[PDB]
Structure 1
Amino acid sequence: IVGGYTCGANTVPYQVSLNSGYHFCGGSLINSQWVVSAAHCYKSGIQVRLGEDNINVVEGNEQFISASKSIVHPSYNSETYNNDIMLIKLKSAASLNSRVASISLPTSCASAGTQCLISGWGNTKSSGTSYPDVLKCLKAPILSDSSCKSASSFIITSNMFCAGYLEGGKDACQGDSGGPVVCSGKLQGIVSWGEGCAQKNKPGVYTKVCNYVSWIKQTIASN
């Protein structure tokens, strides 16, 4: 997160960290046994860390649970980033409380202008490199499809949406991938990709979760 602020310990109870010996991606707890993340974050031997704030210090509220099964969207295209979403089932159910809670799936897509909260442990500099140990937060508005497509050098599909600032300075970054974009108490997006970080005229591109609710529900119901 570039240009964001320290969220505050456990103020984002659904935020999870994907670990493979180190933090590499974010994710969202959608129920006691399932996590949603980005397909490009796929990797074998994933361990899900819940209730985290400082990812380098055990503070007492964490839950470390190995992934028993990962499911990349059937139509994920790594070349176009279309359908960049993945589901991860936990070997055992998480113990829900005030610091570990699930986020609701949306029943309708969010409209442009809506204010959303993006969070992650990603790089905090648009040029240099500096990874925080505590969770960073950022408030950002969903942009209109036209300005989104207009700003992007690549093709924006109907399964993506832009959020952020055209004036640069605030954006998600390397390490934030797979993380949540929550608006009005609903998970509306997944940190997917961008052309650099917080560059002027280059907003963040996110997976539009409202288009996958049916796939998500059917999948967890049958697995």
Structure 2
Amino acid sequence: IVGGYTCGANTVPYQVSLNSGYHFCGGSLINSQWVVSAAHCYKSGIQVRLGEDNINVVEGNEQFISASKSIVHPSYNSNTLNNDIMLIKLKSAASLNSRVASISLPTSCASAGTQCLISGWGNTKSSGTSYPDVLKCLKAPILSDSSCKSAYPGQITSNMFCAGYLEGGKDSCQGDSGGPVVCSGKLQGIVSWGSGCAQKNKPGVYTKVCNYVSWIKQTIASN
């Protein structure tokens, strides 16, 4: 997260860290046994880390649970990042509490102008690299589809939305991948891609979760 703020320990209780010996992606806990992340975060041997603030210090509220199954969206296109969404089933159900909690799926899509919370342990610099150990937060509006398509001609599908600031300086970044965009208490986005980070006229592009609720629900019901 570039230009964000320190969330505060466990203030984003649905935020997960995907760990393969190191943090490599974020995710969102959507029920006690399922995590949603980005398909471009797919790899084998994922441990899901819940209740994290400092990902380098055991602080007392963590739950470390291995993934038993990962399901990349059937139409994920890694070249275009269309349908950049994946489900991860935990080997055992997480213990839900005030600091580890699921985030609700949307019943409707959020409109441009809605303010959302984006969070992650990604890079905090737009040039160079500095990775924080504690969770960073960014409040950002959803941008209109027209401004989104104008920033990224030919690259925005109906399964994507832009959020952020056309003036730059505030954005998600590498390592925030797969993490949540939460608007009015609902998971509306997944950190997916962007041109660099926090660059002028290059807002973040997010997977449009409301388009996948039926797939998510059907998949969880049968797996």
Deviations 1:77-99 (A, max 9, x none): 00110000000000000000111
Q: Which residue of 2 aligns with 1:171?
A: 171
Q: Which residue of 1 aligns with 2:202?
A: 202
Deviations 1:101-152 (A, max 9, x none): 0000000000000000000000000001100000000000000000100011
Equivalent-residue separation in structure 1 for 2:153 and 2:193 (angstroms): 12
SS in 1 for 2:148: helix
Equivalent-residue separation in structure 2 for 1:158 and 1:98 (angstroms): 34
Matched, 1:15 2:15: yes
SS in 2 for 1:212: helix
Equivalent-residue separation in structure 2 for 1:98 and 1:31 (angstroms): 14
Of residues 153-162 and 106-115 in structure 1, the stretch that sits farther from structure 2 once superposed is 153-162
Equivalent-residue separation in structure 1 for 2:154 and 2:124 (angstroms): 24
The CA deviation at 1:154 is: 4.5
SS in 2 for 1:18: strand
Equivalent-residue separation in structure 1 for 2:25 and 2:80 (angstroms): 19
Deviations 1:2-24 (A, max 9, x none): 00000000000000000000000
SS in 2 for 1:178: coil
Equivalent-residue separation in structure 2 for 1:108 and 1:173 (angstroms): 26
Q: Which residue of 2 aligns with 1:106?
A: 106
SS in 1 for 2:118: strand
The CA deviation at 1:153 is: 4.5
Equivalent-residue separation in structure 1 for 2:68 and 2:147 (angstroms): 40
How many residues end up aligned between the 2 structures?
A: 223
CA-atom RMSD in angstroms: 0.5
Deviations 1:152-200 (A, max 9, x none): 1441000000000000000000000000000000000000000000000
Of residues 144-153 and 76-85 in structure 1, the stretch that sits farther from structure 2 once superposed is 144-153
Equivalent-residue separation in structure 2 for 1:135 and 1:155 (angstroms): 30
Task: Give TM-score scaled by structure 1 length.
Answer: 0.99
SS in 2 for 1:150: helix
SS in 1 for 2:69: strand
Deviations 1:44-102 (A, max 9, x none): 00000000000000000000000000000000000110000000000000000111000
Equivalent-residue separation in structure 2 for 1:178 and 1:103 (angstroms): 14
SS in 2 for 1:70: strand
Q: Which runs of 5+ in 2 are unaligned?
A: none
Equivalent-residue separation in structure 2 for 1:4 and 1:86 (angstroms): 26
Q: Which residue of 1 aligns with 2:117?
A: 117
Q: Which residue of 2 aligns with 1:45?
A: 45
Q: Which runs of 5+ in 1 are unaligned?
A: none
% of aligned pairs identical? 96
Equivalent-residue separation in structure 2 for 1:129 and 1:13 (angstroms): 26
Equivalent-residue separation in structure 1 for 2:154 and 2:49 (angstroms): 33
The CA deviation at 1:217 is: 0.2
Task: Give TM-score scaled by structure 2 length.
Answer: 0.99
Equivalent-residue separation in structure 2 for 1:70 and 1:155 (angstroms): 26
